[PDB]
Design a protein around this nucleic acid. Structure first.
Lengths: 109, 33, 46, 120, 55
RNA sequence: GACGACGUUGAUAGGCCGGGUGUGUAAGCGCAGCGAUGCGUUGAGCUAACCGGUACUAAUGAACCGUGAGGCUUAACC
RNA sequence: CGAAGGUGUGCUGUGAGGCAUGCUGGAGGUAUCAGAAGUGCGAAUGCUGACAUAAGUAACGAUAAAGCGGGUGAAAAGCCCGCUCGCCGGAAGACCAAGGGUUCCUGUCCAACGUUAAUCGGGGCAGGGUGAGUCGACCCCUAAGGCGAGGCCGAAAGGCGU
RNA sequence: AGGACCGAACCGACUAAUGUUGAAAAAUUAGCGGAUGACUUGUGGCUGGGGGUGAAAGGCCAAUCAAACCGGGAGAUAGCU
RNA sequence: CCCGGCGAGGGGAGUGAAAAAGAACCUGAAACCGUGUACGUACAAGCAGUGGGAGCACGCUUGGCGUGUGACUGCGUACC
RNA sequence: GGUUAAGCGACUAAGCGUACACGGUGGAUGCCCUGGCAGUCAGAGGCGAUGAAGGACGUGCUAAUCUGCGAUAAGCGUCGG
């Protein structure tokens, strides 16, 4: 049985989140939680929240036994970007992209 | 108990883009005069 | 540096205000064009 | 190169560094345990342990020296009345550094520095 | 100052081939409280090498 | 990044002890002088990165990676 | 009982192309023979929108400077309280005019805005707040100047002026 | 007394450096000139495009000037790309 | 109902013919960005294809055929 | 069988390519029409000192916005439907 949790429109670019996502792909959930706890990235907090949500969803809506769950799939997709403005010198203006990401964690046994 | 604001009177952010031509000095650039 | 716009309400109204537009027939023609276009604000008068 | 050179400048000038370490030494003597960044500890040691060594022997001249280094009379009194007697038989090493993670705001390596007795 | 040709996604991946993070893989377990912690660091509960140090 | 030293069976760094070096006779007290100041205690006191020492503080027991005799073919060999 | 469109596969013609049917889609489509064209795009430093690259690189806006303790909080380098330190001091203090227009004060929130975080804010939401015979305006008086009954000029519009 | 002298406010802009996708579409820092006068400044007013104004540089007239800006003749014309 | 900050987001349940119709809502193309699987690739020089061509992996078949990849090799300097 | 020697040599993928499967972003395409465009036939060709065109401010059980209305203020009288 596969259980999914997503964080859509997370405020972080997909590249930065993928750096953390590749740390836990294929790991047991307890090991993944430790890895995420001792990772000094902003994205580690977001991915840990999604992983905890997936574990809770599995346990509640599906069967149980947190102890044999693994991170079967994980991927980060790009979300919509927010277009902003950065003023530069000599009256010029630049586009700022505030990139977001969709985080998906699939947990299974 | 707290409730939900559900207003965001600044939610819609209008975005634009405009620039300005820049003077450059070319006089020693020249292969001529 | 000093920029071109140096606001002053009295000068603004005396130059582009409603009573200044109404004083001459050219200014009255400015108002007619703006009424024909359907402008929400006819003049700088506020 | 910086061969054989000692002392961190900690992205500060000399007078700022002096003032900051005076404040930190006063704080550590007052509270006996403080939370700092790991590199600001390991430098507070070289400032605060000579103070205790100076306080080991009580004299008017020594109290004036301690006042010059720590412009706080409460800190001088605590040094000479408690810390000198408390550490009278210890040969250096009056402080202890414990690493305690990373700062939330900037990921700075944190540490606790404390006096080894702390009235345990 | 600037490229003459757009670099490929292949070159972008080749460059990023060194950007991978490394996991700690080395969590220690305190002898008294039994909680996991970073080696040479305080535990979340304030223990170190089996002694309550912070509280 | 790397490279080198060391991790309690330890001098790896800090502190501490002794020395050296540098600056030059601290503070307090006493005496002389109306006073600035001088003299004594006194080359005194301070002294960074140096030298020689010293477990006082920190270098934790774990854990992690790396395996389990190492292809085939001929040619000699025992 | 599955149209157009989308997406595969197979077949087929010398080519532009055609035919069939899997999935998606959920209501339209059109043999044939004629008729009419906003009838075919890769380029025009073409136009509009979307998305790349450089690149997780430069930078985060005065080199006046910060350090601790406590509080609140999901979370505190940045908020609050305290103690120190530092900076301005004919100003980087205080009061206005002009201009602005609620930014003011209190309570709540943290999406977006704030070059980071934010529990904070000149941000969002709600509520409150401006009291005059003497201050100012209005008002009386006129300067420069403007408008100007009649008037004098000027194809018209209008100019000058008592 | 003084278009007098030295020098802050105030008004300028001689040199250097930095900056040149700037903190800034002309600035900053260190120096520099005038500083009772042909000075400087607030608030109003007047002069309008072949026109104004100019201690005169083709200077300035809203970051635009050997003829402003906006709208119109207008889809000017283009033996050129 | 559950995770979460009395969040944002999400997983269930339920409505509905349909929720990959969930309000960032009919259909959803392309550029662009990912996860998974097969094959190739760390001694080899260039418009990146085409002609030849092992090996491997799938399906059909019972050696063959089809599909993907493509070591090695001849020729080969984009378009307007 | 073992031991030396010589020769030959699958298994690696930090990453990358191609194919396929599944997604994200994005908003094309198809389908749609309260909106436009061009006409034909017929009207009406003016409103204003009895204060116009166009506005300002108000007006509701509540008070942003739109519509209506004007201190009689989403309306009052009367005659008809």
């Amino acid at each position: 049985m596969e259980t999914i949790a997503k964080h859509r429109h997370a405020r972080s670019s997909a590249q930065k989140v993928r750096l953390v996502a590749d740390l836990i792909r294929g790991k047991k959930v307890s090991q993944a939680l430790d890895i995420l706890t001792y990772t000094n990235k902003k994205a580690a907090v977001l991915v840990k929240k999604v992983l905890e949500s997936a574990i809770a969803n599995a346990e509640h809506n599906d069967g149980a036994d947190i102890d044999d769950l693994k991170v079967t799939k994980i991927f980060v997709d790009e979300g919509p970007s927010m277009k902003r403005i950065m003023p530069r010198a000599k009256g010029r203006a630049d586009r700022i992209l505030k990139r977001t990401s969709h985080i998906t964690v699939v947990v299974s046994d | 108990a707290n409730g939900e604001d559900s207003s965001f009177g600044s939610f819609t952010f209008t975005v634009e883009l405009f620039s300005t031509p820049v003077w450059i000095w070319w006089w020693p650039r020249i292969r001529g005069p | 540096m000093k920029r071109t716009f140096q606001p002053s309400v009295l000068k603004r109204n005396r130059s582009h205000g409603f009573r200044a537009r109404m004083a001459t027939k050219n200014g009255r023609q400015v108002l007619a064009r703006r009424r024909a276009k359907g402008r929400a604000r006819l003049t700088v008068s506020k | 190169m910086r061969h054989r050179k000692s002392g961190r400048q900690l992205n500060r000038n000399s007078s700022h560094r002096q003032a900051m370490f005076r404040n930190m030494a006063g704080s550590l003597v007052r509270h006996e345990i403080i939370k700092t960044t790991l590199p600001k500890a390991k430098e507070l040691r070289r400032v605060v342990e000579p103070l205790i060594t100076l306080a080991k022997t009580d004299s008017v001249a020594n109290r004036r020296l301690a006042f010059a280094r720590t412009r706080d009379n409460e800190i001088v009194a605590k040094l000479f009345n408690e810390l000198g007697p408390r550490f009278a038989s210890r040969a250096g090493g009056y402080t202890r550094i414990l690493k305690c993670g990373f700062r939330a705001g900037d990921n700075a390596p944190m540490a606790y520095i404390e006096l080894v007795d702390r009235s345990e | 100052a600037v490229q003459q040709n757009k670099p490929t996604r292949s070159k972008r991946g080749m460059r990023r081939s060194h950007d991978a993070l490394t996991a700690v893989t080395s969590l220690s377990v305190d002898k008294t409280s039994g909680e996991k912690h970073l080696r040479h660091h305080i535990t979340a509960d304030g223990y170190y090498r089996g002694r309550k140090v912070i509280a």
